[PDB]
Amino acid sequence: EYTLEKLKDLQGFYQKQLLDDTVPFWFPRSIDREFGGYLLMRDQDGSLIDDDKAVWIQGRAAWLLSTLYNTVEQKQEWLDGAKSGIDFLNRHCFDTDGQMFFHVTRDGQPIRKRRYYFSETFAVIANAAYAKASGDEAAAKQARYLFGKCIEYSTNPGTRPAKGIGVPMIMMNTAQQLRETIGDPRCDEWIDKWINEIETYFVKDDIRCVMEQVAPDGSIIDHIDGRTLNPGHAIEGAWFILHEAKYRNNDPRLIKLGCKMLDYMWDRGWDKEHGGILYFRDVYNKPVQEYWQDMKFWWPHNEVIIATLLAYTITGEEKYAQWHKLVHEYAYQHFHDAANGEWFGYLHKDGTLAQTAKGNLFKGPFHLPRQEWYCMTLLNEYLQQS
């Protein structure tokens, strides 16, 4: 049972991990004093395995430092750290056609450019949070400008057309962060549209499933890619929705939507043999072909930790406390590196470490610190209401 006492202990646990373990692993040592931005591709002991810079993570790291400055402690070095990432994005991470790169060298030369625009969304939330921390009007203007571009990209884009849940999900969280930092009048109405898109097209009540992609009419694509589910990704969307429910005075309709997405994908995603959240599943339980389908990655566990704790504090249903205990204990016992700090990223299905790196092209200071920060803040709010 999750008593107020137990929740007080959890609150302090997440706060301690975030500020004494997770953040100090990255900062300030990751600040690139020569070229700006952050050097984040680090091995278990903090040594660099690469000096390249993932553009998504540059924005995510700048967003995190600004968010800590805004909501934890106005530490100058966090503000200076955030600005370094903001400046690096503006100086080096935009191609001549206006689209952002995905992967650049230490000194900002382009390695790869992806068609999509997730790079832009993370620049939005970085600039929005930094603008609030610093009062920089150029960053606020940039955040709103890029937000409008992302809205256009999402509405004005192979004989098998598919739509992905990732677009409405990322745009929803981008809009939420923009709203909660500097504000934008478009946030609420577009969040409504993206929630409706998730509910209408991707949430399947008859088979108790949340899809990753569907046909334009919402139907299931009964092929290898179309059948492939990502439980952690669906549950990330679930807590985005629960977060919106909380913002809207605990809107019961959004609570039911968020909770059933969580219920559906916990059942499909939790590994009953070894524990943990499996990376991919198949809607019809056909063999999943993506090679890492049964691996245990860090970030699905971060998102399910948030979602279960948030669902519990909203609904008081003890099952979400039980699920939270399971995923919390599994994740901190399997991913956390007590020796060097932070979390390993990649475990085999059975929980054994696959490789020792803690940052790369995809992992950095985002999913874990966000989870510890969100849970710390959530429980502080919850406990000061009781």
Which of the ranges 3-11, 86-94, 283-291, 331-339 carries the binding residues for a copy of itself, by CB under 8 A?
Answer: 283-291
Q: Which residue among 67, 360, 367, 372 contacts a copy of itself (CB under 8 A)? A: 360
CA pair distance 312, 185, nearest whole angstrom: 31
Contact 215, 227 (CB under 8 A): no
Q: Is 285 in the site for a copy of itself (CB under 8 A)?
A: no
Q: Is 380 in the site for a copy of itself (CB under 8 A)?
A: no
By C-beta, is 162 or 361 nearer to Cl ion?
361
By C-beta, is 185 or 287 nearer to a copy of itself?
287
By C-beta, is 256 or 286 nearer to a copy of itself?
286
Q: Which residue among 21, 52, 199, 263 contacts a copy of itself (CB under 8 A)? A: 52
Residues 65-94 interacting with a copy of itself (rule: CB under 8 A)? none
CA pair distance 301, 39, nearest whole angstrom: 25
Alpha-helical (H) ranges within the chain are: 4-16, 23-26, 55-71, 76-92, 118-134, 137-155, 166-181, 187-197, 224-227, 231-247, 252-269, 298-315, 318-334, 367-383
367 interacts with, out of Cl ion, a copy of itself, none, CB within 5 to 8 A per kind: Cl ion
72 interacts with, out of a copy of itself, Cl ion, none, CB within 5 to 8 A per kind: none
Cβ-based neighbours of 315, under 8 Å, separated by 6 or more: 255, 259
* CB of residue 371 to Cl ion, shortest distance in Å: 10
Which of the ranges 200-208, 235-243, 280-288, 314-322 carries the binding residues for a copy of itself, by CB under 8 A?
Answer: 280-288
Q: Which residue among 16, 29, 91, 112 contacts a copy of itself (CB under 8 A)? A: 112
Q: List residues bridging with 229 in a β-sheet.
A: 281
112 interacts with, out of Cl ion, a copy of itself, none, CB within 5 to 8 A per kind: a copy of itself
* CB of residue 187 to Cl ion, shortest distance in Å: 24
**Tokens 């590994």, residue located:** 271
By C-beta, is 281 or 367 nearer to Cl ion?
367
- Residue 142 is encoded by which pair of tokens? 């940039």
Residues 307-346 interacting with Cl ion (rule: CB under 5 A)? none
CA pair distance 17, 116, nearest whole angstrom: 34
Residue type, 373: W
Q: Is 212 in the site for a copy of itself (CB under 8 A)?
A: no
Contact 169, 239 (CB under 8 A): no
- Write b or e for each residue in 260-298: b if 16 or more Cβ atoms lie within 10 A of its Cβ, otherwise e: bbbbbbbebbbeeebbbbbbbbbbeeeebeeeebbbbbb
Q: Is 96 in the site for a copy of itself (CB under 8 A)?
A: no
Q: Which residue among 190, 264, 279, 366 contacts Cl ion (CB under 5 A)? A: 366
Cβ-based neighbours of 337, under 8 Å, separated by 6 or more: 44, 343, 344, 358
Burial of 216 (0-12, 13-18, 19+ CB in 10 A): exposed
Q: Is 287 in the site for a copy of itself (CB under 8 A)?
A: yes
* CB of residue 103 to a copy of itself, shortest distance in Å: 10
Closest to 61 measured CA to CA, from 152, 155, 125? 125
Q: Which residue among 295, 304, 310, 378 contacts a copy of itself (CB under 8 A)? A: 295
Interface ranges with a copy of itself (CB under 8 A):
41, 43, 49-50, 52, 105, 109-112, 158-160, 223-224, 286-289, 291-295, 346, 348-350, 354-357, 360-361
Interface ranges with Cl ion (CB under 5 A):
363-364, 366-367
